[PDB]
Design a protein around this ligand. Structure first.
Ligand code: NA
Ligand code: NA
Lengths: 249, 249
């Protein structure tokens, strides 16, 4: 049987205090009847209002990035600062940070290891671009990324690690990957974890899919065997995110 | 004579909820006689707490970084989000962001221009490192940095602009800067503004010294003709930042 599903909401760099408050009101009054870990990743600025406002028992607050240690790094937020603030979940290694802000496979890995060592629950983001897919390099690309992450981690650290496979071609483009495209990618990841890390770990590991998911395609995507939830971006700002949660059985 | 001095506290990626609150409480209980604009620049996480705790009427709050627009930029904060959050000041182009996070002269200039257009008071940071100073390109680097910013600004926009000069060569590198060296860099900046933008702008332009400043040398540093205040790093986390404020006469 699949492990506990996860419906992660990546608001990215969006939202006002009022528009996010109205979105938080919907989540609080949302009745969820199955076991699923819902995750709301807001900006650093909106973390305080989200902590006080969102009170749903199946929801947790997360950050979208962090650096390992505190110090003379103007503009950045560290893991001890987030931990002092009461934030225990975090999204790390998003393709936008991998592309825009120079986060390599090794920088992402060292951030994951530091967060797990700080007690964080980490959603590590991997995935291939469109040029890597049409060149037939989705396999080497995706696994190269997770291999760097696993290298900096021990076996017991995977209980704090969640993998979110997001193909860059599907992120914010409206071109969702078909259930076969998602299942073939998640199965390729899970078998690597079973071979290198362990079979018990690969069974415990949660592989989420992200990329233009909405209320209409979520149910059919989750029916695949190796899909343990969703990382939602554009639809996480809209009332249909409730439907994405319910689509996790 | 001199325009309104500025005492800006750059806490960088530092602080806990308890430690920063005690520091804010000490700031709030401090009697400041003369006219001076005090600025507290915390991490995004602590902006909400600083917004409630800080009550001293001569104090405002600032961000340490931002991107121009909101959108699909996981982990970053944008200017409209900060403006919606009640943040009216911002520090941009800090040397640590120019070195670690790919902020070039053009990228810095684009953020400053977008910040002014969004209603922000901008503390724009410039300065040269030791290698650039030992190789004798202080005037080359410093003037190139401010020219990149100026070519994206109109004459009226300089009312919202504050320049911070960072002597990167004299911050924790064993080299002790003298007040005469700070004055020379400040006079270099202002005279260029006077001939390139206008003498009226240069007369009102606040040029802040962003070196290693303590409450002792801050008096002699501020006595220089073209020093209009300080952009403090390490001492800004300490109660002696108050002494740096009072050193602005
Ligand atoms: Na006042
Ligand atoms: Na002015």
């Amino acid at each position: 049987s699949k492990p506990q599903p996860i419906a992660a909401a990546n608001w990215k760099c969006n939202g006002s205090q009022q528009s996010l408050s109205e979105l938080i009101d919907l989540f609080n009054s949302t009745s969820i009847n199955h076991d699923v870990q819902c995750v709301v990743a807001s900006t650093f600025v909106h973390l305080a209002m989200t902590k006080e406002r969102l009170s749903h028992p199946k929801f947790v607050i997360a950050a979208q990035n962090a650096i390992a240690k505190s110090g003379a790094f103007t503009g950045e937020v560290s893991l001890p600062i987030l931990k002092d603030f009461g934030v225990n979940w975090i999204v790390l290694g998003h393709s936008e940070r991998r592309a825009y802000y120079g986060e390599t496979n090794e920088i992402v890995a060292d951030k994951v290891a530091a967060a797990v060592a700080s007690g964080f629950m980490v959603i590590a983001c991997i995935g291939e671009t469109l040029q890597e897919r049409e060149s037939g390099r989705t396999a080497v690309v995706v696994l190269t990324q997770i291999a760097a992450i696993a290298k900096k981690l021990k076996k017991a650290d995977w209980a704090k690690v969640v993998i979110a496979y997001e193909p860059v071609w599907a992120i914010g483009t409206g071109k969702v990957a078909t259930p076969q495209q998602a299942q073939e990618a998640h199965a390729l990841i899970r078998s690597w974890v079973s071979s290198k890390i362990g079979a018990d770990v690969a069974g415990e590991l949660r592989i989420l899919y992200g990329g233009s998911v909405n209320g209409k395609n979520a149910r059919t995507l989750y029916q695949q065997r190796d899909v343990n939830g969703f990382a939602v971006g554009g639809a996480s700002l809209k009332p249909e995110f409730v439907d994405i949660i319910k689509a996790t059985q």
